[PDB]
A paper describes a structure:
Characteristic of these proteins is a tandem of two C-terminal kinase domains, PK1 and PK2, that are separated by a long intrinsically disordered sequence. Our study of PK1 from Drosophila obscurin shows that this is a pseudokinase with features typical of the CAM-kinase family, but which carries a minimalistic regulatory tail that no longer binds calmodulin or has mechanosensory properties typical of other sarcomeric kinases. PK1 binds ATP with high affinity, but in the absence of magnesium and lacks detectable phosphotransfer activity.
The atomic structure of dmObsc-PK1 was then elucidated to 1.75 Å resolution using X-ray crystallography. The structure revealed the kinase domain followed by a short CRD tail, limited to the first regulatory helix, αR1 (nomenclature as in 18), with the remaining 8 terminal residues being poorly ordered in electron density maps. Helix αR1 is amphipathic and its packing against the kinase is mediated by a cluster of aromatic residues that includes the conserved tryptophan W3469 at the helix C-terminus. The overall structure of dmObsc-PK1 resembles that of other CAM-kinases, e.g. DAPK, which also displays a CRD tail that is disordered beyond helix αR1. However, this disinhibited state of dmObsc-PK1 -where ATP and substrate binding sites are exposed- contrasts markedly with structures of nearest homologues, the sarcomeric titin-like kinases. In dmObsc-PK1, both the catalytic (C)-spine (residues I3199, A3213, L3267, L3312, L3313, I3314, I3371, L3375) and the regulatory (R-)spine (residues M3234, P3245, H3304, F3327) are pre-formed in the absence of ATP binding. Finally, in dmObsc-PK1, the activation loop is in an open state so that access to the active site is unrestricted. In summary, these features indicate that dmObsc-PK1 adopts an overall conformation similar to that of canonical kinases in the active state. More globally, nucleotide binding does not induce either global or local conformational changes in dmObsc-PK1, with apo and ADP-complexed crystal structures being equivalent (RMSDCα = 0.18Å).
Numbering used by the authors: -1 to 0, 3186 to 3472
């Protein structure tokens, strides 16, 4: 057998991802092993097909696949720096708004590659942003189990997802467009900068009712230290009406990213990691259960 399966690296709704070594080379890969429920097989096959459709620096690449009667294993590119939040931001005492803009721009470049070929990601959460090398700053977007071709003139419902990162149109059982991904980018950006999810309820049902209602604000003190452009970027994505949201190419033109064209000086505001760490502990526990 070509792969030596080692320690658990992450887990999601379809299975657990492990470190894998290709024996014949010594090269390191990620091995996603499906939970033993046969209804997950279509999602594994969809992820394999989608990974083989993309070819972009900011999207995880496929490598190999095999199966038993019950379960599918996918061997894929290893993001050796781990998850952005768990393994990079939360290993620091502070990060900056400029750091986050750098990560989100790359996330948008990955999404843009998908949207250009008519595919929506459909399931983006904070755990799906990865870093390619230890200590690095290159983003890899992952988890294409829910990704699909979107016909903008013949929309369909999206019946699955993590409740803290779905959009109002998902909760309301309406057709889902490319603008759903853009809502989730605004939500991820809000979480990365302010360290909390503005729709979090006491349980999943209440979270969903808060998303259905669609109201949120910048009340926490941290937001007074985020730039006008950063708040404007979020506010042009977290809009109840899907057609009002920025599409991916408009988002890439937003003035928020102009700061990445200048250098990093000694005056960037330093954001502490405590809030994000508290939200991440909650988020991670959702996948333990």
């Amino acid at each position: 057998g070509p792969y030596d399966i080692g320690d658990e690296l992450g887990r999601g709704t379809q299975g657990i991802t492990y470190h894998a070594v290709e024996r014949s080379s010594g090269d390191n890969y990620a091995a996603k092993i499906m939970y033993g429920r046969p209804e997950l097989r279509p999602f594994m096959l969809n992820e394999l097909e989608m990974m083989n459709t993309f070819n972009h620096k900011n999207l995880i690449r496929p490598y190999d696949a095999y199966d038993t009667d019950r379960s599918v294993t996918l061997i894929m590119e290893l993001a050796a720096g781990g998850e952005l939040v768990r393994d990079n931001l939360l290993r620091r005492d502070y990060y900056t708004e400029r750091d986050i803009a750098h990560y989100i721009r790359q996330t948008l470049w990955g999404l843009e590659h998908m949207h250009e070929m008519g595919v929506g990601h459909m399931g983006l959460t904070i755990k799906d942003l990865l870093i390619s090398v230890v200590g690095g700053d290159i983003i890899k977007v992952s988890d294409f189990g829910l990704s699909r071709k979107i016909n903008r003139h013949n929309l369909s419902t999206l019946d699955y997802g993590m409740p803290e990162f779905v959009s109002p149109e998902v909760v309301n059982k309406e057709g889902v467009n490319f603008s759903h991904d853009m809502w989730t980018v605004g939500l991820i950006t809000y979480v990365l900068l302010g360290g909390h999810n503005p729709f979090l309820g006491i349980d999943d049902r209440e979270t969903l009712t808060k998303i259905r209602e669609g109201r949120w604000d910048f009340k926490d003190e941290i937001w007074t230290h985020i730039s006008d452009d950063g708040r404007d970027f979020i506010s042009r994505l977290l809009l109840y009406s899907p057609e009002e949201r920025m599409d991916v190419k408009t988002a890439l033109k937003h003035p928020w990213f102009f700061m990445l064209d200048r250098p990093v000086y000694d005056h960037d505001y330093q954001i502490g990691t405590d809030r994000l760490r508290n939200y991440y502990d909650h988020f991670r526990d959702w996948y333990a259960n």
